[PDB]
Structures are given as structure tokens and as C-alpha cells.
């Protein structure tokens, strides 16, 4: 029996060698491998394969997965491969070949009475996104990010108060405690950032012991050499991360003095290009350093025709100052340093000069604009953009996970990690997903008329599902705590209801560990022109006219 390759693609989704355009971008992925046995794929339905004695076996629950996503085309930092995905006890069980071993060959994901099925044929499946620059301005940002395909939210805030409006900080044990309790209500994994700015280390150890998994150093609370030094000493002590928004005003020193204060210690520099904040005009040079994990926030991704007008006014709304801060030269170079692997994470800067539901779409807009301007990456091997795709997906998945010491639980589709997965139709890849799974349960998805005969008639819009409800939600999300808070029983003392995860490895991670984004360039910024150079070569780019993943998809 044979089947033409087109019929095969139509039936089971694309296989080795076939290519797929990502949304309306110029980006194309090519299937690298397919873990199936042709003739033995599993499909669910009337007269299909997943039926008793056939693709479905006789095993007890312990011997089969709880869920199988059939014929998924996985896009992750490690490969673009066709495979069945088995999820068991809310975790990724295996990436391989699903079925019944009693009659099928090569079965690595056993299907039994206890197995539900999500049909992934023709879809692309990714890990859930991880946004590490959240301002907890309002709880509404949770569903907003979740709908976008972001499953983990790290940041700080207490709601719509001046401190949170400006900085990602949940100040003090009482607000940290209230925010950990509030986290149980939200369908995304959450970790909190405390206020890192103080020169007395005990006031920081207290916040850490309270539950924060990191500390934000923000210039609005005084990003001085002494404050930065204190937070780094505590972070080294308690294995928690330091996120930095530096002294734009150059009040306490220049970017080299902040650099001398970090003293080669591990730190995550937020909005590293500097329009979102930092030493004017040269904060960007931080990406040269081995101990720096640099992210961009999103309003400057990618550089477009309206970018500068918009930002100059935006900054004025929230003169020599405005102008030293918003610069075309550093804005134009940031797209390219992303292209080059010199910037490692993308993040939002939620409702504080960034858009909470746009981390993934903008990351892809930047990959498209770079392919368009620069052509294929030196790393590319065939006639496709597979390497660039793995380089950029790593920026909102595995790299933020590693930066924040939670890559052991989330960040990629790998065995043993939490089953936070996003199912996409290729036409809507990166903009509107088909299904958002949190720890093994679907938590939000587009849903048509609740009274209709099928789930597809209009209006179709995002509605929270069973993994977003009460105690099933608590079972399917993680609250991340510091090792100290976990050890002191903060979870039990606050009666937190969700599953708890503990961060670790926040000091050991370095630039060489950012997947496909480890470049340490000899970067300079000219004091007078603000031009950015790496080894004397001008790093620049052109603003987009129009972007993909924009007007074809959105009602407003």
C-alpha cells in the first residue's frame, strides 16, 4: 500500500522533507524527522485506529498515558519533528510513537482505556511561553498572556499602584504573601520578584524567605552600586535571580561602574537595548558579558516605521532626557543582535512599556524582518529556516526558564517537565492558538456558540476551560518559591492550594548556557552618534513598513 505525499500530508500532517510557512511570514520550517512507522500512525474517530484491541490496548492506567496528542509537528529548540506526545500525571511522558503494543510495532506511548486524545495532525505544537518581565498591574494580564500561548509569568507588583506601574516589584513579606495567595486564582505558573533596592541585606533575605524567586533592581528605587551589590550578595546566598533596570540618569556612575558593581556575578538585564530603561546611551553593551542573561522587552521588536514617534511620545506621556533614551541607532541594532544570538530572551514589560499578549508574535515578527533583511543564518543547513526558528523560539521558552531557575519544570517539550503545551494551526502560528494546555489539562481555547450543535459555529472567541477552574486549575499550575520559602513552609502557612515548584540554578547559569543565543560580541556604542558596533562594524537595520502577524488577524 502507498499513498501519495500530498494525501499523506492531508491525512496525518506533513512528514520528513515537507515544508510549512509559519502564519503569513516568510519563515518556512521543514520536517526534520518523523518518529512514526508509515502505516501505523494513530488517528482517533469513527472506524479509526484508536479503538479497543486496535490502536488502543488493554493496559491499566499506570501502564498507559493520560493523554496523547497525535501526529503533532513539534517546533522546539531541539528540533522540528513529527511525533506523538504522551502526557501522564500532568507531565511529558514521551515524544515518540503512540499506540497498542499488542498489535503495533515500535510503540513508545501506550494508549489504553485511561487515555484521552487531542488530534494534532496538521498542527504545530510548542512548549508554553515564559514571560519574565511582568508588572502585576492587574490580574487580567494572566488570561491575556495565556491566550497568546504564554504559560508561565514571572514578575512583581501589587496591582495598579505607582510602585508596580513603574517596576516589577512586590515589596515586602505581606504583599509577597498576598500575591502568592492571589496567584492560586490565575491559570498560569507564577513566580514573584521582590524589591531588590536596599543596602541592608536582611530586608532582602526577609522577602526571599517570604517567597520571591528573584529580586528586581530598578532605578526608580535607586539602582546604585551599593543596592545592586547587596541584592547580588543575597541572590548568591539564596540561589535566586537578580533582574536589572539600570541607572539611566548615569547618577551613581556610567554603565561601566554598574558593570564594576555586578562584579562578574549572574544577573538578568531587562530591556537591554535601553528604550525600556538603563544607562543612556550604552546599556546595550551589557550583552558582551559572560555573566549577563540579556532580554529585550517587546515594544521595540521589531523596528518599524511608527516605532520612534510612538516611543518618544510614549516615554514623554509616562527633553534632552527623552532623546538620550529613545534612540533609532540602538533600536535598529537590537533586531540584529537578536538575529546573531547576542540577546537571549524576549519578554513583555506588561502595561509598563510592553504588551502582555504580544511576546510570541513580536519575537516571530523580528525573525521574519531579519530573514527579510539579512537572509539565512550562517547556521542554516537546508532550504528552510529551521535554525533561525529554533534560535528565536528559545528566546521565549527555554532561555527565560534557565534564567530564572525553573528550566527543570518548564521551558521546553522534554520528558519529565510540566505538560504546558500550545497547539497551533500553521496559519495562525504565533498569533491565535488552537489549544493552550496547562499541566496536562486544556486551560483556554477558542470556543464557538456554547448552545450550538458543534463547538465551531460563531462567535468563536477565547474562553477558559477546565484546567482554569478552581481545584483542577490549582492541580495544573505551579507557584514557584525560593528554596528558603519552601523550607520555611510558606506554602503551608499561606494555605497555598497550587502545586509548588522551587527555583534552583539561578546563579550558575551564564551567557554560554542560553540555547542558540550565547553570543558575547565586542560591542560598543559611540557616545556622540550612538551607533552600535561590534568589532568596528556598524550594526543596524531598516524599519518595517508592514509586518506579518498584524492586520490580517486582528479585529482592532
Amino acid at each position: 500500500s502507498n499513498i501519495s505525499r500530498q494525501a499523506y500530508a492531508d491525512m496525518f500532517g506533513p512528514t520528513v522533507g515537507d515544508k510549512v510557512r509559519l502564519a503569513d511570514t516568510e519563515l518556512w520550517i521543514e520536517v526534520e524527522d518523523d518518529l512514526t512507522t508509515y502505516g501505523e500512525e494513530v488517528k482517533f474517530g469513527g472506524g479509526k485506529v484508536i479503538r479497543d484491541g486496535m490502536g488502543q490496548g488493554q493496559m491499566l492506567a499506570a501502564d498507559c498515558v493520560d493523554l496523547v496528542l497525535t501526529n503533532a509537528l513539534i517546533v522546539d529548540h531541539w528540533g522540528i519533528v513529527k511525533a506523538d506526545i504522551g502526557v501522564k500525571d500532568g507531565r511529558i511522558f514521551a515524544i515518540g510513537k503512540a499506540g497498542n503494543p499488542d498489535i503495533q510495532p515500535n510503540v513508545t506511548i501506550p494508549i489504553g482505556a485511561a487515555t484521552e486524545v487531542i488530534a494534532a495532525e496538521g498542527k504545530i505544537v510548542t512548549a508554553g511561553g515564559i514571560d519574565t518581565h511582568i508588572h502585576w498591574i492587574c490580574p487580567q494580564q494572566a488570561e491575556e498572556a495565556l491566550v497568546s500561548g504564554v504559560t508561565t509569568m514571572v514578575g512583581g507588583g501589587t496591582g495598579p499602584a505607582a510602585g508596580t506601574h513603574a517596576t516589577t516589584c512586590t515589596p515586602g513579606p505581606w504583599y509577597i504573601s498576598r500575591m502568592l495567595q492571589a496567584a492560586d486564582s490565575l491559570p498560569v505558573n507564577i513566580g514573584l520578584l521582590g524589591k531588590g533596592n536596599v543596602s541592608q541585606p536582611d530586608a532582602l533575605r526577609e522577602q526571599v524567605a517570604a517567597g520571591v524567586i528573584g529580586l528586581k533592581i530598578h532605578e526608580d528605587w535607586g539602582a546604585t552600586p551599593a543596592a545592586i551589590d547587596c541584592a547580588l550578595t543575597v541572590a548568591d546566598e539564596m540561589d535566586i535571580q537578580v533582574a536589572l533596570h539600570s541607572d539611566t540618569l548615569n547618577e551613581s556612575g556610567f554603565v561601566e561602574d554598574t558593570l564594576a558593581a555586578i562584579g562578574g556575578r549572574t544577573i538578568h538585564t531587562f530591556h537591554t537595548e535601553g528604550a525600556g530603561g538603563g544607562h543612556a546611551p550604552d546599556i546595550i553593551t551589557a550583552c558582551a558579558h559572560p555573566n549577563i542573561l540579556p532580554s529585550s522587552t517587546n515594544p521595540t521588536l521589531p523596528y518599524t516605521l511608527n516605532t520612534i514617534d510612538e516611543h518618544l511620545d510614549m516615554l514623554m506621556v509616562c527633553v534632552a532626557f527623552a532623546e538620550s533614551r529613545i534612540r533609532r541607532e540602538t533600536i535598529a541594532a537590537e533586531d540584529v543582535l537578536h538575529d546573531l544570538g547576542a540577546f537571549s530572551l524576549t519578554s513583555s514589560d506588561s502595561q509598563a512599556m510592553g504588551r502582555v499578549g504580544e511576546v510570541i508574535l513580536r519575537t516571530w515578527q523580528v525573525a521574519h524582518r531579519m530573514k527579510v533583511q539579512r537572509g539565512a543564518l550562517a547556521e542554516e543547513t537546508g532550504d528552510n529556516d529551521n535554525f533561525r526558528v529554533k534560535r528565536y523560539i528559545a528566546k521565549y521558552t527555554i532561555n527565560p526558564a534557565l534564567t530564572h531557575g525553573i528550566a527543570h519544570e518548564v521551558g521546553s517539550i522534554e520528558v519529565g517537565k510540566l505538560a504546558d503545551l500550545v497547539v497551533w494551526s500553521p496559519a495562525f502560528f504565533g498569533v491565535k492558538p488552537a489549544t493552550v494546555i496547562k499541566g496536562g489539562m486544556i486551560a483556554i481555547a477558542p470556543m464557538g456558540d456554547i448552545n450550538a450543535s458543534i463547538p465551531t459555529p460563531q462567535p468563536v472567541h477565547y474562553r477558559p476551560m477546565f484546567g482554569a477552574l478552581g481545584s483542577a486549575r490549582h492541580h495544573c499550575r505551579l507557584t514557584f518559591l525560593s528554596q528558603a520559602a519552601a523550607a520555611n513552609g510558606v506554602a503551608e502557612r499561606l494555605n497555598l492550594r497550587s502545586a509548588i515548584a522551587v527555583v534552583k540554578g539561578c546563579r550558575t547559569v551564564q551567557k554560554a548556557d542560553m540555547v542558540h543565543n550565547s553570543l558575547q560580541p565586542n560591542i560598543t556604542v559611540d557616545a556622540q552618534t550612538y551607533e552600535v558596533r561590534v568589532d568596528g562594524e556598524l550594526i543596524t537595520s531598516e524599519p518595517a513598513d508592514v509586518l506579518p502577524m498584524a492586520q490580517r488577524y486582528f479585529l482592532f
Binding site: 496559519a427 448552545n451 458543534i454 460563531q458 490580517r552 488577524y553 479585529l555
Partner: protein, 100 residues
Amino acid sequence: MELTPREKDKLLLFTAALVAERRLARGLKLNYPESVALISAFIMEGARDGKSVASLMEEGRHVLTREQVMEGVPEMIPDIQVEATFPDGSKLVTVHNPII
């Protein structure tokens, strides 16, 4: 009015269709959500009028042409489905390959 959840939900679809109807009137090529809203609201008004499921399956294919919508749009909408109260109760209308 004693509006049930399903009535209030169609209220949303109707409004999304007003946005599209005004943009098409200005002469814009419609995008994906716009096109889906416009056609689906149109089918809801034909049920209200007492047209048949069979008729609305064909009339729904004459609301938007390939020329009035952006590139790729026709390919993103292989069908549009919406249910409405016909004189003989709620019925599902699927408009197949609506935009050519």
C-alpha cells in the same frame, strides 16, 4: 428581555459584524475576523427573515468576494458556521468556501 448567555453571545457577533460592515463601506479589503463576522451576522439576519437553511447555505457564498478581502483570507476561511433561530427553531448553517 430575559437574555440567556447564548443570546448575549450573538450580540457580540453582531457588533463585530458592524465593525466590518463600516470598514467595507469605506472600501477596505477585509481581514480574517472581519470577514467571518460579516458573513455570519448576515446568515443570522436571513434566519430572522424566515429564509431556509438550504438557501442561506448558497446566499452566504455571495457576501464577500476574493477582491474585497486581503490576501490569504479566502484560504483561512474554508467555511463559516453559525446557528440562529429560524421559524422552526435553532438550526446550523454551514456556508462552504464562502469567498471566491
